[PDB]
């Protein structure tokens with residue numbers, strides 16, 4: 077039940093999503109090992125993901141969380157990079173999309189920095205890079221990221237050493 | 238998947254060394270995220 081609608085680059089919605097992507101690039105402590113060496117992206121396409129069943133699943137949970145947290149869902153827009161992007165857009169996020177060995181336990185991870193999520197597009201630590209050239213810093217191959225609506229509710233704050 | 242800490246719905250990883258890093262977040266229920274936008278892109282080689 078998922079359809080993808082292309083946004084025009086003239087659409088204000090395309091432009092605000094592109095700005096969030098570009099403006100949250102940073103340098104990484106691995107010198108580019110996982111995600112590649114870059115300061116900006118070439119955005120090729122932005123598509124809206126439309127699935128009524130998955131949206132209703134989200135809003136059902138959002139209301140449950142809101143009611144447990146003084147009517148505050150604490151909703152954010154965050155990036156997610158994954159080799160499972162095709163499964164996610166068709167079937168939703170679930171346990172198969174969790175980072176089992178993550179710093180904060182086995183859950184589904186999201187980032188404010190688009191470049192952080194870019195490190196996971198080809199797998200944990202960038203895996204072996206792009207399927208065609210085996211290059212984690214491939215400048216040719218097309219990559220995909222999700223920009224996701226995420227309900228945080230009451231969030232446990234972990235300081236990172 | 239793990240459970241959220243008791244009385245919490247997510248975890249926020251706040252950076253405490255790298256002053257330029259933004260936060261990262263973890264949820265433990267797939268129903269707490271919806272994939273709104275699919276962005277297709279290339280990384281650009283620095284000049």
Ligand SMILES: O=c1[nH]c(-c2cccc(O)c2)nc2ccccc12
Pocket residue numbers: 155156157158159173174175176178185186187192193194196200261
């Ligand atoms: O975008 C992310 N994806 C993933 C990710 C996605 C799918 C599988 C997996 O093992 C990790 N982990 C992250 C960890 C920190 C910050 C961002 C991400």
Ligand SMILES: [Zn+2]
Pocket residue numbers: 206207208209210211214215216217
């Ligand atoms: Zn490639």
